[PDB]
Design a protein around this ligand. Structure first.
Ligand code: GCP
Lengths: 468, 79
RNA sequence: UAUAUAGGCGUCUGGGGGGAACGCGGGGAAGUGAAACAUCUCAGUACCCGUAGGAAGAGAAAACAAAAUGUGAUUCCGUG
RNA sequence: CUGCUGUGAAUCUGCCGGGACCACCCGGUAAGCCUGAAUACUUCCCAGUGACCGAUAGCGGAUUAGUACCGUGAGGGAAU
RNA sequence: UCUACCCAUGGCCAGGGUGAAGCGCGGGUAAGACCGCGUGGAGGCCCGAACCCACUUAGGUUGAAGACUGAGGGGAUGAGCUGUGGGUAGGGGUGAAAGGCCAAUCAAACUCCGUGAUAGCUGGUUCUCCCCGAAAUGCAUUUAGGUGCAGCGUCGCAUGUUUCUUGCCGGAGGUAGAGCUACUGGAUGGCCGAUGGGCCCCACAGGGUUACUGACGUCAGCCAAACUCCGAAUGCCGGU
RNA sequence: GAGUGAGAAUGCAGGCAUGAGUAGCGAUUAGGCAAGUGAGAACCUUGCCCGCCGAAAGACCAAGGGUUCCUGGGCCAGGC
RNA sequence: GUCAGGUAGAGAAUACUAAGGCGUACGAGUGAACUAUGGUUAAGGAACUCGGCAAAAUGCCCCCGUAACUUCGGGAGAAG
RNA sequence: AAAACACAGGUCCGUGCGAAGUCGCAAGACGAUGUAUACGGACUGACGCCUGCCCAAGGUAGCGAAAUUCCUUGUCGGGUAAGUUCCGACCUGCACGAAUGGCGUAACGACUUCUCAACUGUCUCAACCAUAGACUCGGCGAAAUUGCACUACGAGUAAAGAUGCUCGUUACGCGCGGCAGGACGAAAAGACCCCGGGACCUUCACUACAACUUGGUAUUGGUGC
RNA sequence: UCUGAUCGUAUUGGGCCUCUAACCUCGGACCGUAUAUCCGGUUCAGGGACAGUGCCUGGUGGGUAGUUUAACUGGGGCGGUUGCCUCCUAAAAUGUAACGGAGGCGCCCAAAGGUUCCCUCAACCUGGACGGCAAUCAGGUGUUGAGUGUAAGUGCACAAGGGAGCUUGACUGCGAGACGGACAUGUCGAGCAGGGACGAAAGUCGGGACUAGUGAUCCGGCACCUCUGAGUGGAAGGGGUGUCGCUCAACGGAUAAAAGGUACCCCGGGGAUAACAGGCUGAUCUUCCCCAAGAGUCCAUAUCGACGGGAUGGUUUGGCACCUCGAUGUCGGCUCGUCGCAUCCUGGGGCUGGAGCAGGUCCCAAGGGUUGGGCUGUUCGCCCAUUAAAGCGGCACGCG
């Protein structure tokens, strides 16, 4: 079974140009604000990242690590360094290239480390192969994605659906690393909490006994069954009223909540994190002339949407498929906003595949104008396709986002001319308050005007609609 | 789920063996102690392990001097 | 085969098997006790083989003893 | 004091024992025999005995008893 | 004498099918191989009674019976079935091998003997009244459901209040409580304040500084089995 | 001087209850009548009729049994 | 182990019968539920059930026609 | 009662012949009245298939395929209303496993698991009929079990599941035929689990012995170096 | 014979080659013998002092036998302990369990021991080249906060802490009287003599400031002794004194010497102890509630409702081990049920983000009803086609 064992001796794994024990390990990551990463005690885990170069190049090569460093920071632990490889072939064992297990163990011992991350879901063995070698707590992209939601959880809906997603992510890897984590347990506090992550509930662990895990997944599934009824009951008035609705669809950190605060005077939370707004929240707004429409946010969508966590985004998906006009917020940080938008848009495709109604009208926007395009200039503003953006990284003025949004929203409101006579002392008040008052060509006595009206007011004034 | 603890030591029966106003023969132990909880006064001697023993027949007495409790053997008068 | 012997022939005298115990000689367990177990004990018992006698076996110092002028085959009892 | 295997002496200034052994003393005189009495036991017989049983007892067997009967056999084995 | 295998000598297998070799004839050919036809009747061949076995199901299950019956089943010229007579005997046999069978039992058969095996285990242990009257603890244990010693019972002997209760007197304690600016810890909000940074002069030296920080310290309120500057009540040890 | 005191040992020997006058009275064929016998008859004897086996449930031989064969007599045990 | 009638049959299967031998040893009633052994079942046809378990169904003789594959023997009584 | 044993076939090892091997303390016996084409042991278990340049010394030399199924990797459909066994094209780079183990295989099987046709009381869903019991009458006549007795129910209490105790309810005495919910029903001093003892088995547990083998010496001698 | 090469002759062992008379041959031929594949005898032919057998001896040896294979343990296993020392638990004398909370030990020192004498640190402040926060030095403040070889505690500034001089008491022969104590062990000891050390003397010295640093008996080793000495003198051996050898650590130590399987099992017992069942608890679970931040278009309460808090039921996973092991037979299905309501349908209401059609949630309501199939052992669940619905639960997870 053991053949010539000279592979890292003379042979090269995937060294087309740069691979096979190269471990570029560039881009040392890390970032410092005022120093005092912790200020009293171990508030940083001194984590390290990993990346596997695949289809693509510098356009995306470092993009994975760029996203992961920010995400781990959001979790609240200093990222020491990142490490990738060209990796022509993803080895199912550890898909890391030449199995440089000793090399990575040594380069993580040279650093404080004591925590490692990965990119993509890892099979139980696909991660044990590195757990053994590294001898340190290892938690991959989906584990951290779930831990972020757990930490940020606020309401029963979240504390149940994130819990279910975590249990079901454990399901395929209940053997091995889960027992490895429980062995020493959290030890006061671990690097991965439970249902609420940020202390509080979920302090004990995620998976401890297969029986209890299955029991709790059952109970949680019933709970989401209950919550679906509750949610559809709550979402009655809008569907019963046929009131146009719009949705803020942004990848993450694209200032969706901040934009909502703007344009509606809303006071929703706007925190620095890739997953800040927990549940889709909405508010009534007014178009240019009226139309007391509805505007809702969306929850963060990150590249390679972890399918292990869909119960959380199910509510968001419903709220986007039950809408008319979609406005696509982007974040002006990365270098490939085109990739950001295409990636986030890859999800609406399956959204419509499942709940096919229609392709809703689409509009584009990108926040962070003040800090973005520092070397981009107005190329993305003139040459690039449909897009409007004035929000700043803190807030700005809105000029035509509220005009084109109305011109692109459903125009179901009939605009056929109607004749309103004097009749009662203020009979025209009904039309003035309902159907807007656009073009109030007030004349005299039995004032003659031209304004739009909805289906019931149109049918009520039909007989009185005498041509001009 | 073993326990690291579980060990202990035997019963070193320390403590005062003759209390105030007790008639003693020469050589008897008065307190078995560890260290110098008590000191010797008159007719009281210290042994190897900080034991206190009588040096004359008499009656035990506990007093203080210079800030340290001391044990003494007051000589009983023959009636 | 030569002496000769094996062998053959005849004739005379004996053995053969049984018996309850006891005798002498020879093989000889294990259960058990040891709070387990192997030395050890059980025990030279059980059992077996040989072999008799009215009884057998041992018996006439190449002995004990200790300076006593000692006792004087063997056997079996009682002490030691 | 003895059984097997090797080796292997002197005839009285000889040889053995006297609790390793050595000297002096002391006791015997190996490698040849036979020998009663005191002593162990009751298959059997005769005459008695019992602070022994008295028919579920006393022998398994007071009556067909090693019978009937059970087992291929060794063997077990009643009741009156 | 059952059963496993083996040996000697006998016996049994209704009926009906297919048709291998061998042999003869004819084609194919140098040539046989090969191809049709005939006799022939091989086969651990086929179907199926006797016979042998035991796959399914029902019945029985204090049965008709300590392994059977009914109805279907498998083999049925063969490694076949069976009669009579023999051989292999227990740590041994025999085994197309199941720890199967060896006389209704087999991970070592039966009977008698050693033998009244041993069992820290379970059961049993037979008439009466009077007096006294427990323990379920400590230590040790190839020990924990046993046992030895001590403790606690009873009886005899010796002394006699030494026993015990109450008062008073003489003692050591660090528990309850309480206290922390008295020790070791954590911690609550203020006050001043080095580090300072950043700012105004501008040096960098030298002056103010500065939503702020807490070095030390200060004020008010805290708490602790393994904290104690203190510290009871009971208990205990003597005397009277 | 004791084989001296039983209510228990799923104790042992004998006798007798409860279940209970209860289950069962043993194959898959089947008996009926007339007459007799006799105290007594479904079961015995005779005559008829009906039914069953008929590669036996008929007739022999061997092993095994040991008198069970036949005649006369008898009917308290046995014959479910 | 030996004998092996007649008819239908290939048959020593099966059915009924000859010779021969039996009716073999508790009966008489009674349309109870229920159990066992047989019989039949409308219409559907495995829905039963762990599973077509059991039961049903085909079944004989003579003529036609017989597949995939094959160790060239078969398959094969193919099946129809 | 089978997939297990056997089997014809194959491959190793021992045996040169009162062999090897086995029974026996030995003699002796079988093997064998046989002789390496034979005998004994050991695995496997008809039959077919399994792959090249280096490979008085050429060099990494392991093929680097296959008829490969752990291969629920949805990796799709056929199987039907919904279909398990399966059937076929994909992900199936050390995957795997096989130089002596794997693939195929006609025929066969009271083997295991499925689909179709026919057939049906298996079922929807049961009804009826006959016989043998049951039942009644006559005769004979047991058995296991058994501390007792003119042996209710509810809620409680109790060694924690009450015929037997407490408080209430209900019930005329005695039988017959049936059902099977209790009497922790009968049966067997629980086979499970633990403790103690035992037995048999395994082994590089301990200690012995059989047997084998190594040397000294007796049998055991002479002459030459 | 003392200091001593080689000698002449006679006594011998081994290695090697042979021979024949020991011995061997199931190689032949004859005789007992009429039959004899037995056996013995004669002789021939081959081996041959080998082989085989006796006594002795070293290896291999489950081929066979006798046995061992600990205990605690919130059942057993697995894991972890097993002796000694210190603290808390430990309830102010001593003592006191738990698989309770923390740790150390299996030594070290010839000076870190004895004695005589002298000194006082840590920390802080002020000043000084390297030299700094911290080295050495100066002054001051500094009563214990440094240190005390080693764990923790009790004590130590009177110093037991820090230096120095000299010394070996890290003695021999004892020991009144006590502590602790099941016993065996274990600790203290004033003082007497001999000979020493230190000190002017008085005085202290029988190891370390104290408490751990260890192992019974048996058996045997090594030095000395006025012991004993198997007739006697000796010697052998024994005896006394002093000491030596055990991770006998399972540390009161069965043997000098020892692991496992059993579903092929068996016997004696146990509800002292488990699996099912009941019983208590309710951690877990289910049913809800309290408060309301927030969501819900505005709007806490139509519908939800976080962070927190309180309970009900005894169905889940568990805890305990109270009855039952001289027997309480396990799951799913079938037949037959009966009950609770926490209501799936049918029935009556409130509110509604109730236009109507319908929906949501809550209240009252248990009369009756609540399908057939394919897969799924499946605990269970997925699918198919219907219905008004295909309810949830208890009854030994009802009923063998
Ligand atoms: N680009 C942008 N960023 C803003 C704006 N206002 C605030 N931010 C910053 O962006 C940070 C992230 O908030 P925001 O991007 O609104 O979160 P989100 O993208 O709406 C929702 P999620 O974070 O889950 O993806 C905040 O810390 C805030 O300081 C804005 O108008 N535009």
């Amino acid at each position: 079974y053991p053949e010539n064992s000279v592979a890292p001796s003379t042979g090269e794994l995937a060294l087309e140009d740069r691979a096979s024990l190269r471990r570029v390990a560039g881009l040392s990551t890390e970032l410092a604000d005022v120093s005092e990463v912790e200020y009293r005690q171990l508030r940083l885990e001194r984590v390290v990242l990993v990346g596997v170069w695949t289809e693509g190049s510098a356009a995306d090569a470092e993009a994975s690590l760029a996203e992961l460093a920010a995400l781990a920071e959001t979790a609240g632990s200093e990222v020491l360094e990142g490490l990738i490889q060209r990796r022509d072939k993803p080895d199912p064992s550890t898909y890391i290239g030449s199995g440089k297990a000793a090399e990575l163990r040594e380069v993580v011992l040279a650093t404080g480390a004591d925590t490692v991350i990965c990119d993509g879901e890892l099979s139980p063995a696909q991660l044990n192969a590195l757990e053994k070698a590294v001898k340190v707590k290892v938690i991959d992209r989906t584990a951290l994605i779930l831990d972020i939601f757990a930490q940020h959880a606020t309401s029963r809906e979240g504390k149940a659906q994130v819990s279910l997603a975590q249990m079901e992510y454990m399901l395929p890897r209940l053997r091995g690393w889960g027992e490895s984590m429980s062995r020493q347990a959290g030890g006061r506090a671990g690097g991965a909490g439970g249902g609420v992550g940020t202390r509080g509930p979920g302090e004990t662990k995620i998976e401890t006994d297969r029986r209890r895990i299955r029991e709790r997944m059952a109970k949680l599934r019933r709970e989401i069954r209950d919550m679906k009824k509750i949610r559809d009951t709550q979402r009655g008035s809008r569907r019963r009223s046929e009131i146009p609705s719009v949705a803020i669809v942004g990848y993450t950190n694209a200032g969706k909540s901040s934009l909502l605060n703007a344009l509606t005077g809303a006071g929703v939370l706007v925190e620095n994190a890739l997953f800040a707004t927990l549940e889709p929240t909405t508010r009534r707004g007014e178009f240019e002339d009226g139309r007391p429409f509805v505007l809702t946010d969306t929850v963060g969508f990150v590249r390679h949407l972890p399918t292990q966590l869909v119960e959380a985004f199910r509510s968001t998906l419903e709220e986007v498929v039950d809408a008319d006009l979609l406005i696509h917020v982007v974040d002006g940080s990365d270098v490939n906003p085109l990739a950001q938008i295409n990636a986030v848009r890859t999800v609406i495709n399956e959204v419509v595949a499942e709940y096919d109604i229609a392709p809703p009208p689409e509009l584009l926007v990108v926040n962070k104008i003040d800090a973005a395009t520092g070397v981009g200039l107005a190329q993305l503003r003139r040459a690039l396709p449909d897009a409007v953006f004035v929000s700043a990284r803190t807030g700005d003025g809105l000029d035509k986002l509220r005009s084109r949004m109305g011109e692109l929203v459903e125009s179901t409101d009939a605009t056929v001319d109607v004749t309103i006579p004097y009749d009662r002392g203020d009979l025209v008040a009904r039309v003035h308050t309902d159907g807007h008052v656009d073009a109030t060509e007030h004349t005299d006595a039995g004032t003659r005007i031209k304004a739009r009206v909805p289906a019931p007011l149109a049918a009520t004034l039909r007989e009185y609609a005498t041509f001009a | 789920s073993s326990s690291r603890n579980g060990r202990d030591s035997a019963a070193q029966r320390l403590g005062v063996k003759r209390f105030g106003g007790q008639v003693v023969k020469a050589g008897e132990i008065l307190v078995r102690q560890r260290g110098t909880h008590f000191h010797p006064g008159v007719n009281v001697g210290r042994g190897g392990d900080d034991t206190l023993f009588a040096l004359a027949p008499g009656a035990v007495e506990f007093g203080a001097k210079r800030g340290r409790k001391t044990v003494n053997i007051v000589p009983v008068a023959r009636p």
